[PDB]
Amino acid sequence: MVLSPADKTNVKAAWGKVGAHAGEYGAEALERMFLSFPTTKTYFPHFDLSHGSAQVKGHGKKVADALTNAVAHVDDMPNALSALSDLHAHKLRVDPVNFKLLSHCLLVTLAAHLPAEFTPAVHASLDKFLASVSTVLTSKYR
Amino acid sequence: MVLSPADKTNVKAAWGKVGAHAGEYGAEALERMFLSFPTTKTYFPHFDLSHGSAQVKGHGKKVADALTNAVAHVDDMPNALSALSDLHAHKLRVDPVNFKLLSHCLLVTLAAHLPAEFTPAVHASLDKFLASVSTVLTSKYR
Amino acid sequence: VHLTPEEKSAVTALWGKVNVDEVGGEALGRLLVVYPWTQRFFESFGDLSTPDAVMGNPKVKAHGKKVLGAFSDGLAHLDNLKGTFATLSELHCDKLHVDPENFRLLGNVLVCVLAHHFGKEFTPPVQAAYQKVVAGVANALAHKYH
Amino acid sequence: VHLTPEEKSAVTALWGKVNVDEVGGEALGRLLVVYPWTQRFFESFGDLSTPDAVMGNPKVKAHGKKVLGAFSDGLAHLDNLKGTFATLSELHCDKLHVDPENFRLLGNVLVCVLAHHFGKEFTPPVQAAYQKVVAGVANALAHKYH
Ligand code: HEM
Ligand code: HEM
Ligand code: HEM
Ligand code: HEM
């Protein structure tokens, strides 16, 4: 797939609004995933997954920054997430199915926090954006 | 999803051996698919899906031929399959999930007919190749 | 579905605040906008040319009320969904030819809509409860496919 | 699972000809080769660097035999897969931390291997019966996840 210019405009607008809450939204998305899709917990046996744990808060922040980086370099994601792409492919080795679950929980979080901005068109653009990030992150798996 | 030179070599070699039987294997893959994953039948309400149906055999040949064309243009798949991407995206509108099911059935078909050639390395290359074809076919969905 | 008493009450409690017709129209419109391939069943509905046209189409809105009203009635039978949706499952398979993946898409779009509608009240545990319900309904609807 | 008498006999008939040791080894080896991320559970197994390395690895062949032998056991209890696998379900979740999606990939690779091994005898109807079995097994193993 590919993002149209209109998609990039919607993402930039919505993400811009997240602004300084990116890390807090990042943490909430993870908590929503662990609760809704418990099988994702299999990748975090080394974490205190208790609500508000610093590990989750910290991880939520690293996830948010990476999304910020991709929004910023929306026209050259492969290059922007290169490092993350290697990490997931060669070390973490998270089954590709899990990316769709996190993407869903990130969309739900954004929805819950952006009443004005979460229109059908933006919703569509964000979904596509999350799918693209997911594709870039799993692109070096095999 | 990048096809290395060895992947390309593997695919051309295996498809090479399919040769004349491509259409027969295409029909067999469809049959396997309809029996194993009945939900896929929802896209062919207009077909006689019985064993030996000429419609399935006819459709099987069209699929197999498209695959042959993909192998031939393995370096330029998007352009080679352009009309097929348009078709699936804008008219047929087959849910992307289904592509994985046909791909699996094609692999099972190849396995059952190419004992010698279906090594673990070739199996991996073919799986990557069918995932690339699927990606191309769904690239214009949204 | 296996929902603890707590989960059941959380589902029931939010649902009581839902304008079924409204959310129905919204959820169905958003499905057709976010996953355009789903428009394949709706060519008789008219103009689905843009998000605005989809969201504003009276046919989409009508079909949404119909779909969500059925969903809504199902909420009363959390313990017997397969039973409750058996006839509809057969209908969707035999006459309508609807790939059950569409039920899963709609369930995810429905959760996003509730999230958008309820904001902060749609907590992680309330989401989890709704996820089990939407998966349960999708499963119940796909049950009679053959 | 729900198997017709003909599906049950097809499953049973083919399985009597399977050398579990040999097929188990092949199935697990092909899993690690085709979906290399699955190697993350087998860091202590040695060299999994090449297909040849993976396929002749004795720890792979050994483990493969264990897995299919346990799989063979559920074939005997097709009517109670969850009950048969409950203990191993809890083990894989709680101690092993294996994402259940891996059970699904193994199921698919196993089908490929039976087709490779049996050729023409692995007909469309036989495959279909096996696809229901492997899905049942994967489901039985993910059952106690929490
Ligand atoms: C939108 C998709 C994702 C993004 C942007 C993302 C990003 C990141 C980042 C930035 C890191 C930290 C890198 C470092 O510290 O060097 C990381 C690590 C990690 N991610 Fe991913 N990730 C995503 C999806 C997933 C999914 C779906 C899972 C599993 C369900 C996952 C599991 C992990 C784990 C286990 C770690 C290491 C945790 C630790 O030990 O700190 N990731 N990811
Ligand atoms: C590797 C994947 C696939 C390839 C290469 C492929 C290729 C093709 C080709 C060559 C045609 C004929 C176009 C024409 O009529 O000119 C076609 C049509 C069609 N395909 Fe796909 N296809 C693939 C996957 C699928 C899947 C997974 C489904 C649904 C389960 C599907 C459903 C259909 C349908 C319903 C038609 C129209 C059939 C008719 O009415 O004659 N396709 N495809
Ligand atoms: C919660 C999930 C769903 C429920 C409860 C549901 C329920 C219903 C009901 C109650 C009807 C009317 C049946 C009748 O005419 O007696 C119906 C019809 C129909 N539904 Fe479903 N539905 C669901 C999901 C879907 C989805 C996702 C699609 C397609 C993307 C779909 C496509 C249709 C179509 C095309 C009809 C026929 C409409 C007509 O003839 O006017 N449904 N559904
Ligand atoms: C058909 C599905 C499967 C069955 C029936 C099965 C069964 C078993 C059994 C019987 C054991 C031995 C427990 C013991 O004696 O300690 C085991 C261990 C194990 N399994 Fe599973 N297994 C299945 C699938 C998988 C998959 C797909 C993976 C990951 C790719 C996996 C990863 C493991 C690991 C890492 C161990 C521990 C090996 C060790 O002791 O180091 N299993 N499994």
The span from the CA of D50 to the CA of D55, in Å, is: 8
Q: Tell me: is residue A59 an annotated ligand-binding position.
A: yes
**Burial (0-12, 13-18, 19+ Cβ within 10 Å), B46:** exposed
The span from the CA of A74 to the CA of A69, in Å, is: 8
Q: Which amino acid is at B30?
A: L
- Angle separating helix axes A120-137 and A54-72, nearest 10 degrees: 100
Experimental method: X-ray
Q: Which residues of B touch A142 (CB under 8 A)?
A: 124, 128
After which residues are there C–N gaps above 2.5 Å in chain A? Answer: none
The token pair at B6 is 């060895």
Establish whether residue B83 lines the binding site of ligand 2, counting it when its CB lies within 6 angstroms of any ligand atom: no
CA D118 to chain A, closest CA, distance in angstroms equals 28
3-state secondary structure of A52: coil
Q: Where are the domains of chain B?
A: 1-142
Ligand 4 atom with the smallest distance to the CA of D107 is 1
Continuous segment of H or E residues that includes residue A9: helix A5-18
The span from the CA of A1 to the CA of A5, in Å, is: 13
Ligand nearest to the CA of D133: 4
Residue nearest to atom 23 of ligand 3 (CA): C67
- Angle separating helix axes A22-36 and A5-18, nearest 10 degrees: 100
- Rounded alpha-carbon distances, angstroms, from residue B128 to A44, A141, B104, B123, B124: 28, 11, 11, 9, 6
Q: Which residues of A touch B142 (CB under 8 A)?
A: 1, 124, 128
The token pair at D48 is 């999994």
Are the beta carbons of C84 and C74 closer than 8 angstroms? yes
Are the beta carbons of D13 and D130 closer than 8 angstroms? no
Q: Could you say which DSSP state residue C146 is in? A: -
Q: Which of B38, B40, B95 sits opposite C146 (nearest CB)?
A: B38
Establish whether residue A124 lines the binding site of ligand 1, counting it when its CB lies within 6 angstroms of any ligand atom: no
Q: Which of C35, C37, C145 sits opposite B39 (nearest CB)?
A: C145
Torsion of CA C87, C92, C94, C97, to 10 degrees: 180
State the chains in contact with B (3 or more Cβ–Cβ pairs under 8 Å). A, C, D
CA terminus-to-terminus distance, chain B: 20
Q: Could you say which DSSP state residue C119 is in? A: G
- Rounded alpha-carbon distances, angstroms, from residue D127 to A85, B29, D124: 36, 11, 5
- The class of domain A1-142 in CATH terms is mainly alpha
Q: Which of C37, C39, C97 sits opposite B42 (nearest CB)?
A: C97
- Rounded alpha-carbon distances, angstroms, from residue A126 to A28, B93, B112: 17, 21, 43
The span from the CA of D93 to the CA of C105, in Å, is: 28
Put simply, the answer to whether C51 touches A127 (Cβ < 8 Å) is no
**What is the CA B59 to chain-centroid distance, rounded?**
12
Are the beta carbons of D65 and D29 closer than 8 angstroms? no
Residue nearest to atom 12 of ligand 1 (CA): A62
CA B36 to centroid of ligand 2, rounded, Å: 18
The span from the CA of B123 to the CA of B110, in Å, is: 9
Are the beta carbons of C69 and C20 closer than 8 angstroms? yes
Are the beta carbons of B71 and B15 closer than 8 angstroms? yes
E strand map for D83-132: none
Q: Which of A47, B41, D104, A5 is nearest to C92 (CA)?
A: B41
Q: Which residues of B touch C102 (CB under 8 A)?
A: 95
CA A48 to chain D, closest CA, distance in angstroms equals 15
Q: Which residues of A touch B126 (CB under 8 A)?
A: none
Establish whether residue C38 lines the binding site of ligand 3, counting it when its CB lies within 6 angstroms of any ligand atom: yes
Put simply, the answer to whether A124 touches B141 (Cβ < 8 Å) is no
Return phi, psi of residue C73, to 5°: -65, -30
**Nearest residue of chain A to residue B125 (CA atoms):** A142
CA B136 to chain A, closest CA, distance in angstroms equals 8
Q: Please name each of the domains of chain C with its CATH number.
A: 1-146 (1.10.490.10)
The span from the CA of D42 to the CA of A59, in Å, is: 26
